[PDB]
């Protein structure tokens, strides 16, 4: 077939040069830019339908998840509200809904209890204090979360999500699940268990909770196992039969529905003391002006929160966006989340993200433009105003029952582990990390330590890279290593290392000991022997994988080129990139009888230059 | 001359690999080693005379460097004659000298006062109690220090020294320098400043002594003024003047001689309320089991004291050891200093390294075999013992003094960073960083941070690398990027990238980019458009800078491939290392109709075959 002939001059970096010569309406993304393009003839309709059912489905979520935040329940329907009003100017996206999404509503509530806890607050008890302390955390918290992300949108760094790898995603999603499990067990227990602050905090609550099995109530145990077990069958047998019936079965608003009207029918919170949500605000409150003097308390988790609720939002807007074909701005990301919770942040209201259960949910149901998004506002405030007496003897246990029945995804990792493990090792290890780091630890602490053990693993897998000694396949251009082939003959005199990796101090370290290695000696003690007293005479260096390089790496290959030529060893360099030229001329390497007349385009000019000689 | 020519059938990998086929006495280092081995005939009494030198100086140097401690002078002579002793089985090197080197003496005496403080401690005033606990808390540091390297020695992790960057030294090294004269200069103003613990802590004692200066001592200032001038000036004609007098001329001791000498004729103790040593023990005290319940807090400065004075003591035994032609073991190093930290420890001492200066001044008066350490400590017990009285009416503020003058060169990096930030910014960066972290913060935590700073550095210049499009020299085999050179001459129908860097998560986003913008446009809106309705078909990728690969890496390969296929383009690889190529194999690449056909040893065989069709 097809042959490699060429014919041309041996080239040098010095003779090829001689040859060849070198040489403001985006900010604030209005609601005008689709406004007036809207199309009222068709898609009120699926608006208007897809608006109640996401509406109706995040209600029940927002009332859910103030449980897993040390909030009384009725500032959850606040958070579901007043966020997708201030996000359906600012928002970029075209089909996510604005809510807890309960990791982060457990973020929250951890901070919230460490930093008000029953018996530091009341010395006697007086609840109402307790809710008000709470509400002021969760909402000072809030506005810090988001003066955060509107900070970090004015920046224009919005790809710090790429540092979030997916193992330790996973490793973090494990463990949140696991917190969210054991928080909402003891809720369902009814068992009463003393808060712990700080490491293994959630080995201790185990125990404690283990120790207190004896004073469970009975009613609300049997009504969240009767409730996880329904909803687990129900979920099973949609999942197996899906063929029909694409919208999901709303299992969880029946179940919710039958729970509450029993417990009216029977009364059972004077007939058997069980624990019910028997109270809900109505109307809306004043805004309340946090106090900002919490804020030196409040760094390390607000920076946490705030990258957890920005890229899980990115994640789903850029999976539904990469289906309907557009593309969203990861910037007015961070610029509108931020503004929204600022907004929420001063009405009493915790952290708001996207819940991509509850945008598949509007999604499915006619998915059209953020119109649906008023519609579920609208929704939420008709509840707010007027429903709020019809909830009342609902039990908390359904909902956490709900909450504990929605986390099989969560735990279904485990089983991808060891397929990870099988194909990279250091992505299982990361994996792992992280999931002990958050396990034990706080969930904020295991992510900044997983964050900060991925650049570790990057960093001591670039200075431990491949080095291997080369030769030539006979009567061709090709040079691999001598040991793997079994065909490569070994040059006369001469010896050519390749170094895949870029040079810094650790592989300075490194190279220094692989050239020693290979070469069978070095220059230092050989000098000082034959000083003292009164095998190979080329060596080439295959730098075709060079990337980078600083003063350190520079002042090694200097002391390695003046250290051979003092014993009479020439050194070459070869398939050395451009830039990597200019950060040598400009660290001042070519003084001293240098003169690039050492280096050249690939390692088979430098071998026929030697033979040449 | 010579030319290049070369005749052979285009390889892809499939065709290559067909065609060629693949496939107990060191751990406790004794005196064993040299001691039978010795040279009694000669090396005698060059020990002798090197030994009594050393011991004169670090006498006078441990006396000195018990005050950047909390701790009373006179412990200082037992720092320097502890570690010696049990530092002469174990020690690999043969000209260093063991002691205190100061900046490690303010890191102990910043963790001493800022763990047990005046008015903490003592609520009237008892100095001998608040003597004893600072003792004791400098005796339990030395010792979990101590723990800490024997466990990094065991371990056999000594490359760690290699992640503390040459920029990242000098900055630390500049705001020790400043920490040093700051307390130095606080001390010989004999001005009462309450100490601060935290952030910020230099200015606020700057700013304390700024408002006292006030009640300033006359004689303690002039003697300081006086001491300071004397030495720089001796100091600068002896740097001048230096081709005669191989050894130091022995300023200090001379001035220490003459002001205790004066301070004891005219008794300024009780005439001016000078501020002088007033005490010395005598004798060897018992030892005492430090309280082992306080290393709950004091990890985080351990760690960075054991690691400071283990980079020194290698740092300073590499350079001599090249000097003198012979090799030391770091582990070792590790394990002979921790179990002298913890014989320290026990007998009431602090932390223990090399001291370059008094290095210098054991070598160059006939530097041999560790016999001058034992000669030194003889002379430092002999100063215990009998010469304890002797030096009581020495000041203090002659020893800060002292201290203060053998500042310069650590404040000489200023220099340095204008043409390390002219060579590379990054170090300048790194530099800058270090100095700014360790001014505002602990010493220890501007360490770490440090590190941390330079481990994310490595990782950002990993992940934006250099990018090009390539095309060919005419007439050769050589591509370039054609935007340099002016006569490169793009191929028909093709494009060819060059991502020079490893491929991970970061990298797979960067790479998508550079794809999207070198192609012109993207596969999936074209597919889009196209199944809606119902200039370049080929593209080659340069992998020669291409080090390590991932999971996401290889995801990200596949889908590229797929969706560059979907549209009828076809994408080829060159130049890929094999591992690499194995890493891909284990990854499942190989699956769907990839074959392994697709890939070239260069690109110059991609180019042929797409020519042959
Ligand atoms: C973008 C890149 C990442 C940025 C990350 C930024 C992190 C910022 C941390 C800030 C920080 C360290 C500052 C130095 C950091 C040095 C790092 C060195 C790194 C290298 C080695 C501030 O440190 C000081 O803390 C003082 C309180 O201790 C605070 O209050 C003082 O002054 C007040 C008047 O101003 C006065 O009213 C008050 O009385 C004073 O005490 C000071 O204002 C503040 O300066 C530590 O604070 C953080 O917040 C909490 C504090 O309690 C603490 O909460 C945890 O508690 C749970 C257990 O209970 C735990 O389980 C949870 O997790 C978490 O809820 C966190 O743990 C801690 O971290
Ligand atoms: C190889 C790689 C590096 C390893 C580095 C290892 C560092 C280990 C730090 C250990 C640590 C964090 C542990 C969790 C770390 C989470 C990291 C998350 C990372 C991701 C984001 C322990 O944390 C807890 O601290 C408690 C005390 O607060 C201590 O005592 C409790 O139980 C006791 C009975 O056991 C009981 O008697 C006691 O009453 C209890 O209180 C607990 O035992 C201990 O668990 C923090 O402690 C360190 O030490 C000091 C404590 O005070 C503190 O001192 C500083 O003070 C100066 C200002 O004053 C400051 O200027 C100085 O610098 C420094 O002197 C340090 O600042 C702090 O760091
Ligand atoms: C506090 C910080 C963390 C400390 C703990 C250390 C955390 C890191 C710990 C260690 C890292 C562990 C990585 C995973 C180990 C192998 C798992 C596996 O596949 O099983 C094996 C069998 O799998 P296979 O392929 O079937 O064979
Ligand atoms: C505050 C933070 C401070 C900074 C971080 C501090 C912590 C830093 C910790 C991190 C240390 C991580 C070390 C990883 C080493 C590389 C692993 C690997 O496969 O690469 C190479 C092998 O590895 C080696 O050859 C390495 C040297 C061998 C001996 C090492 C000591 C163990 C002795 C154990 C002896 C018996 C027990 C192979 O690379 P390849 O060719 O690609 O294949
Ligand atoms: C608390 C952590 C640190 C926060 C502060 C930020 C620390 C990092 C800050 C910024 C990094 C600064 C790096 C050095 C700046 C240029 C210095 C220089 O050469 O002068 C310029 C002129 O030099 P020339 O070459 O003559 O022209
Ligand atoms: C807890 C810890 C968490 C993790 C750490 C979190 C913090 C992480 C922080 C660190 C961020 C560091 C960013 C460094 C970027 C690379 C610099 C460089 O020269 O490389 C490339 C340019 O750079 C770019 O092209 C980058 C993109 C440009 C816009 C960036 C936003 C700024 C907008 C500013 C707009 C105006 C204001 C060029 O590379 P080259 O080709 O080699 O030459
Ligand atoms: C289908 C789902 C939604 C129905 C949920 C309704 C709940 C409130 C009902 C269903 C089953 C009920 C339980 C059935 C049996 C008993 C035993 C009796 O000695 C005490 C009441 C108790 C413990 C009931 C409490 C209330 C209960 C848990
Ligand atoms: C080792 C290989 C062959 C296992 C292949 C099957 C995998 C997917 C399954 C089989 C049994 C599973 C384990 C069963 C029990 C536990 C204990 C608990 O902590 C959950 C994780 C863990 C540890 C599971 C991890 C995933 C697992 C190992
Ligand atoms: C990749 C890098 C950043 C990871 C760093 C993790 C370090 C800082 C963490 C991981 C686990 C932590 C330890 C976990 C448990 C305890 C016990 C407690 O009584 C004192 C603190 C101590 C001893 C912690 C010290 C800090 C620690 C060692
Ligand atoms: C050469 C060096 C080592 C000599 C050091 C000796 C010291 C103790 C001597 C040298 C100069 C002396 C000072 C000279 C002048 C005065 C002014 C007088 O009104 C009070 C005493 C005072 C302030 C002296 C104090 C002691 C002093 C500082
Ligand atoms: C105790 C106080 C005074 C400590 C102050 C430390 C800071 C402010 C000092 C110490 C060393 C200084 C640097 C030394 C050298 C240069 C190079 C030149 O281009 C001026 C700026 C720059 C980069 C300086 C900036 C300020 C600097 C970082
Ligand atoms: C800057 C270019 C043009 C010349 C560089 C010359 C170098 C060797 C010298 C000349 C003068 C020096 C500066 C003079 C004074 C100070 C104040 C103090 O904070 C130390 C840093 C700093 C800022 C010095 C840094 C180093 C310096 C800039
Ligand atoms: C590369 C990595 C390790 C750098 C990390 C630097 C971070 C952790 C450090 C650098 C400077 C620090 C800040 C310095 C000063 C203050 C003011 C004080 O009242 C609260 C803490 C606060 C706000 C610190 C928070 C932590 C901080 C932002
Ligand atoms: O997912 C949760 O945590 C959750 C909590 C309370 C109610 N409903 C929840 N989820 C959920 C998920 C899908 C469909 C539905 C619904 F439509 F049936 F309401 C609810
Ligand atoms: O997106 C979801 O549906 C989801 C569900 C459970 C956990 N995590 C989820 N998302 C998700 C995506 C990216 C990053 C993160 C994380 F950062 F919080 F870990 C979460
Ligand atoms: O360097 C110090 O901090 C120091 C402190 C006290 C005495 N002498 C010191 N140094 C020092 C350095 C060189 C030579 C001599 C001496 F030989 F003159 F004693 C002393
Ligand atoms: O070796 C010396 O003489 C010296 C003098 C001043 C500062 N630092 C010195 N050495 C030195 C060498 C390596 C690492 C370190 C550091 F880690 F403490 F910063 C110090
Ligand atoms: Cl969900
Ligand atoms: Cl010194």
Redesign the interface.
Known sequence: ???????????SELAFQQQ????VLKTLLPVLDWLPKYRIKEWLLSDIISGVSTGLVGTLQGMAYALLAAVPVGYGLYSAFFPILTYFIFGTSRHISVGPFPVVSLMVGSVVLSMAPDEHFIISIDFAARDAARVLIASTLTLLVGIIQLIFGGLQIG?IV??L??PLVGGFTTAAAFQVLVSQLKIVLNVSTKNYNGILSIIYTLIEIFQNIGNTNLADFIAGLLTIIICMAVKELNDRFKHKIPVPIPIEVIVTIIATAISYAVNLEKNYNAGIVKSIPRGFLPPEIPPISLFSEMLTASFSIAVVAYAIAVSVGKVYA?KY?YTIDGNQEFIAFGISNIFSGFFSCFVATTALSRTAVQESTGGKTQIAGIISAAVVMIAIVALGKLLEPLQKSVLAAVVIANLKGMFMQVCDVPR?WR??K??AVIWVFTCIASIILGLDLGLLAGL?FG??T??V???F??WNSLGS?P????YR?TK????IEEPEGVKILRF???I???NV?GLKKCIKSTVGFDA??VY?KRLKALPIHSLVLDC?????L???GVRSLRMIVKEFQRIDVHVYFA?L???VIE?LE???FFNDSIRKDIFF?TV??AI??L??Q
Chains 1, 2 share one sequence.
């Open positions: 077939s097809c042959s490699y002939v060429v014919s041309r001059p041996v080239y060849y010569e070198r040489r790809f790429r540092y790898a997916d990469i074909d990870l194909q990279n250091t992505d900060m650049f570790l990057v960093v897998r670039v200075q890279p491949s396949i009567n061709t251009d090709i290593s793997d082939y079994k065909n895949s990796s870029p810094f101090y650790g370290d230092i003690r000082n075709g994988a060079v990337s980078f600083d003063v350190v398939s990139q451009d830039h950060k400009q660290c001042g385009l088979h000019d026929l230059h033979r040449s």
